[PDB]
Structure 1
Amino acid sequence: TTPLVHVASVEKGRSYEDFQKVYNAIALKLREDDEYDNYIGYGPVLVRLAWHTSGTWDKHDNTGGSYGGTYRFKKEFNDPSNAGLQNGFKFLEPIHKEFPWISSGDLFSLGGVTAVQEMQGPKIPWRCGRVDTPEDTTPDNGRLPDADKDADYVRTFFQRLNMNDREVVALMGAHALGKTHLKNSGYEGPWGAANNVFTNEFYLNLLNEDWKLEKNDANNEQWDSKSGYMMLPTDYSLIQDPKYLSIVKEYANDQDKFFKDFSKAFEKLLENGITFPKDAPSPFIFKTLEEQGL
């Protein structure tokens, strides 16, 4: 039961160029399969997948985390908390088939990095080396957070992922992406207008929209605005708690600051639980398709 140590191990003989090729394949498919989810694209769901495959981590015993790529196993794949992520996994299938040498954990996390960057978000340094672990290393369901709670719940929950107030608020900004789907989570609606463009719209909407606490068709409460946006109880708690509120205001007034803080928190989230050898390669910063003229 002793806390295991997960040492990053570079896929045999691979280097930056190999991973840039995987990034490009993911990016090109994001461009190709643009009809998904009423033309939102697979960007948002890939980010959620990267988060859910990483968010199972427990700093106390180093179980869960992005290292093992255990989402490929039935128990985790069927976690009610992961409902809807099968779409992201299916999207990545052809990618993994073309580059069978990349580990599942590296692919799931790289998918999130690729999506954020291609959607015009900040650059996210990414490190390779996650290694697939056995099915018995799959974490039990119930480690991912709930959305019907308050600020105190959020703050306490994220301490298990070693995230502080600023890290939590920055990470939640990803809700500028995609939307909630009633069938997947019991919540319905987008957080903003630019569902597939990474910006600080989440914070601006929290502060500027006129929110009303209503019940959706699943009989769950959520905050709605006449603009057609919604906020989860946990999202709204970010402006109810005074400490979170200060940070929300900061990001709503400084796009660059949000980008830099989100980049650090997201990489941290994707790297929790991994031990990188002193001579491991430095983090990779991939060029977007646009930057490559592709």
Structure 2
Amino acid sequence: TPLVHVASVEKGRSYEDFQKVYNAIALKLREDDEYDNYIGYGPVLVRLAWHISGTWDKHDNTGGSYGGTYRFKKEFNDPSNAGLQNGFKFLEPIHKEFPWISSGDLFSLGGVTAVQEMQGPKIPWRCGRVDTPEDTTPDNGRLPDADKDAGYVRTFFQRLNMNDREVVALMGAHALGKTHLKNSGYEGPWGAANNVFTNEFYLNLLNEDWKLEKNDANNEQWDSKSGYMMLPTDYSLIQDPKYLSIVKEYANDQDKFFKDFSKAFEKLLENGITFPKDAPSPFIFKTLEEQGL
């Protein structure tokens, strides 16, 4: 009924092989530091890994990270994917160096690497995604809109099998990077330390004096006098009572948030994938710093 996507390890590669891909991504992150006014590519990589995974539909098992479909024009040109071509171009040179890794494995590993190199938590990662044909490419319109409320958010995330806790944990990724008018019709960062992974998102949410205003794209965003912004969907996290108590927990405990994020992020990246019992356990990569590199 539902497609079945069995993870298949890239023939004859082990942990050490993947650690080398990780280290290559990481060294390039370190080196190409001028991107987006010195934010670096970390944030776009995280967003890339979420977008390739977010097309999943728990109803017929289509979409998700498995197929590396983002490589196809249809998904690549998804209006909701605007600005991701930058993460793509960053990974190409890497793919050329390690041509045996599948796309889905590379795209998703980029996300893990960025998080960990940006001082976030360790995210267990599993290999085995297999490139699928251009015809398995999901139609556009499965990624969420930003101009909605808590109800939309809850409903949406339900398609990916995420509960309230998972939704709020994952959204704390908004501490990274920023909106770009040209990409999404939103402009501004969510906080100050946008290339370091912290619970800043939650603090800003609770602590700033947010003003609803329209931007130059003629969209409404919540603006703070500190120069930060929140999307309607971000804001909705404090409008819903269930959401708001989680936000509070995270604002209060960065550890808690890190643990929750880690689980939800991995889950997000593994949705739609069946792992045979003989499959290797999830890998935990060392950072550059842990390797002395």
TM-score (norm 2): 1.00
Q: 5+ residue gaps in structure 1?
A: none
Unaligned stretches of 5+ in structure 2? none
Q: Secondary structure at the match of 1:120?
A: coil
- Mapped to 1, the partners of 2:83 and 2:54 lie a distance apart of 16
CA distance in 2, matches of 1:102, 1:192: 35
Q: Provide the C-alpha distance between the structure 1 equivalents of 2:31 and 2:117, rounded to a whole number of angstroms.
A: 13
Distance in structure 1 (CA, Å) of the matches to 2:255 and 2:278: 31
Residue 66 of structure 1, CA deviation: 0.1
The Cα offsets for residues 150-202 of structure 1, whole Å up to 9 and x where unpaired, read as 00000000000000000000000000000000000000000000110000000
1:188-231 CA distances to partner (integer Å, 9 max, x unpaired)?
A: 00000011000000000000011000000000000000101000
- Quote the sequence identity (%): 99
1:97 corresponds in structure 2 to: 96
| Over 4 Å off, 4+ runs | none
Match of 1:58 in 2: 57
How far does residue 3 in structure 1 lie from its aligned partner after superposition? 1.1
Distance 2:87 2:75 in 1: 14
C-alpha deviation, 1:20, in angstroms: 0.3
Report Cα offsets for 1:71-120 as digits up to 9, x if no partner: 00000000000000000000000000000000000000000000000000
Number of the residue aligned with 1:152? 151
Quote the Cα distance in structure 1 between the aligned partners of 2:94 and 2:119: 21
What are the equivalent positions in structure 2 for 1:1-294 lying under 5 Å apart?
Answer: 2-294=1-293
Counterpart-to-counterpart distance in 2, 1:94 and 1:137: 25
Per-residue displacement from partner, 1:8-47 (whole Å, max 9, x unpaired)?
Answer: 0000000100000000000000001000000000000000
Tell me by how many angstroms 1:69 deviates.
Answer: 0.3
TM-score, structure 1 as length reference? 0.99
Distance 2:170 2:272 in 1: 18
What root-mean-square deviation, in Å, do the aligned CA atoms of Structure 1 and Structure 2 show?
0.3
Instruction: Count the aligned residue pairs.
Output: 293
Per-residue CA deviations over 1:252-283 (Å, capped at 9, x if unaligned) read: 00010000000000000000000000010000
Aligned partners of 1:207 and 1:163: how far apart in 2?
A: 23
Distance 1:176 1:15 in 2: 33
Deviation of the 1:48 alpha carbon: 0.3
